[PDB]
Amino acid sequence: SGKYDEQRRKFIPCFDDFYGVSVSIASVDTENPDILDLGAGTGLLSAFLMEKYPEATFTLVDMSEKMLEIAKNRFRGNLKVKYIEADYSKYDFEEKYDMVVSALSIHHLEDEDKKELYKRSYSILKESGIFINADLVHGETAFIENLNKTIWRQYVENSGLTEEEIAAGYERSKLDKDIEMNQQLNWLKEAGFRDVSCIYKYYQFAVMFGRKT
Amino acid sequence: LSEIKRKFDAVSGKYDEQRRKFIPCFDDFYGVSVSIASVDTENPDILDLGAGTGLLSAFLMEKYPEATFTLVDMSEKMLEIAKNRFRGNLKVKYIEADYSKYDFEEKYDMVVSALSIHHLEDEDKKELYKRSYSILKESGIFINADLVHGETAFIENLNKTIWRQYVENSGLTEEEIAAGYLDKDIEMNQQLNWLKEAGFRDVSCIYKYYQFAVMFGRKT
Numbered sequence: 001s002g003k004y005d006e007q008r009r010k011f012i013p014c015f016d017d018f019y020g021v022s023v024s025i026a027s028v029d030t031e032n033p034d035i036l037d038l039g040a041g042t043g044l045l046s047a048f049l050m051e052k053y054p055e056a057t058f059t060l061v062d063m064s065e066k067m068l069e070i071a072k073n074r075f076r077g078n079l080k081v082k083y084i085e086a087d088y089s090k091y092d093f094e095e096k097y098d099m100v101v102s103a104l105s106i107h108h109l110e111d112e113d114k115k116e117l118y119k120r121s122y123s124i125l126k127e128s129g130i131f132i133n134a135d136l137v138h139g140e141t142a143f144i145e146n147l148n149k150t151i152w153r154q155y156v157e158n159s160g161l162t163e164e165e166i167a168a169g170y171e172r173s174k175l176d177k178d179i180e181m182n183q184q185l186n187w188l189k190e191a192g193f194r195d196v197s198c199i200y201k202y203y204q205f206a207v208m209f210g211r212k213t
Numbered sequence: 214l215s216e217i218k219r220k221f222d223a224v225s226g227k228y229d230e231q232r233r234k235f236i237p238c239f240d241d242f243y244g245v246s247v248s249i250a251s252v253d254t255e256n257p258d259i260l261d262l263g264a265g266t267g268l269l270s271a272f273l274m275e276k277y278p279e280a281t282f283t284l285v286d287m288s289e290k291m292l293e294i295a296k297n298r299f300r301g302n303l304k305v306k307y308i309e310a311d312y313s314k315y316d317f318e319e320k321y322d323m324v325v326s327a328l329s330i331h332h333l334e335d336e337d338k339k340e341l342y343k344r345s346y347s348i349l350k351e352s353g354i355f356i357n358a359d360l361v362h363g364e365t366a367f368i369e370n371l372n373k374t375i376w377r378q379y380v381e382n383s384g385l386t387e388e389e390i391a392a393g394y395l396d397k398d399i400e401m402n403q404q405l406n407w408l409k410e411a412g413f414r415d416v417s418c419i420y421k422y423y424q425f426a427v428m429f430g431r432k433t
């Protein structure tokens with residue numbers, strides 16, 4: 001768990017602000033919010049959010065039972081956490097939430113799935129709530145994509161990781177279907193979200209926010 | 214520690230420390246502007262618009278110690294601090310003028326600016342972008358590291374509140390803090406659009422941290 005967090009820090013050159021900004025803007029008018037964490041993985045984003053809202057309810061969704069198993073141990077004995085092994089793109093959510101949040105997961109969906117997930121997220125928020133996606137975004141042109149990737153590879157190659165850990169992470173990134181940030185902000189606006197904004201951006205890493213009011 | 218020949222200068226150092234106390238994302242704000250400032254020559258011609266005490270230029274000289282710099286500012290006092298910052302260095306020019314109205318005749322590899330353009334009226338912003346395009350060399354780049362307005366009242370309040378928090382805990386005197394609480398800031402997309410309108414390509418927001426954004430465009 002610690003080992004999974006410390007490794008993640010080595011692929012994410014803006015780790016502290018990336019997760020710190022996502023937590024800072026995650027404010028709702030309940031100190032007991034119901035939070036849905038899409039592609040929760042080992043539950044790192046939900047953990048940062050639990051520091052801010054210790055009495056929140058969390059629903060972690062992930063295809064990986066293994067990741068979720070790490071999350072359950074991370075959250076040992078916390079009865080306010082629910083775990084669902086499923087593809088959150090396909091899952092029929094029937095509860096309503098104060099927050100729908102995600103880190104580094106939505107860029108793996110086909111573009112049509114992204115668009116529809118943004119749309120569906122609006123409908124499963126309570127009559128009030130927020131959406132936060134801290135995710136990878138594609139360069140606006142091929143030159144900007146190359147710029148973003150060059151800087152990120154420089155960081156990864158110098159993060160302390162071995163040649164084989166570097167190459168393995170590069171292999172994992174071949175399934176990415178990232179798209180331009182602005183196109184994703186447009187899909188949130190088109191879904192009905194207001195106060196739509198990119199709050200944080202560091203080359204390909206962006207924290208995107210919307211509010212249902 | 215710079216890896217180039219600098220002359221120590223007490224005054225410009227003190228101004229640098231205070232700016233870091235007003236800017237919560239200081240390292241990355243300036244760090245990113247320098248990462249993206251890449252052109253082929255090792256002696257680029259760089260224009261610094263609203264250069265102040267020369268801080269953005271000094272960061273850029275780390276990466277390009279033999280570049281030629283032209284600092285433009287309405288303030289002679291700011292510019293004098295810059296001259297003493299770059300004491301000796303023979304390749305810095307200083308011009309006291311409103312960079313938004315001055316007739317630039319040379320061409321540059323880079324037009325850069327930090328925290329200054331948001332003080333211009335919108336029509337002057339729009340027009341500065343058009344004209345910066347004109348005075349750039351082929352493959353030249355435009356960088357503006359600046360304040361942007363929140364997209365809505367709610368996001369504006371979020372940005373301000375975060376900043377005010379930092380600023381009350383960063384070590385600034387209650388004077389300095391109030392000596393800072395002028396702005397015609399506007400939303401980021403509108404500025405990106407204005408760069409595209411002036412002819413820039415590869416227009417992108419490279420970095421953003423609430424109201425602080427580093428915007429980029431290139432002439433090709």
Ligand SMILES: [Ca+2]
Pocket residue numbers: 065085
């Ligand atoms: Ca299974």
Ligand SMILES: [Ca+2]
Pocket residue numbers: 289309
């Ligand atoms: Ca004068």
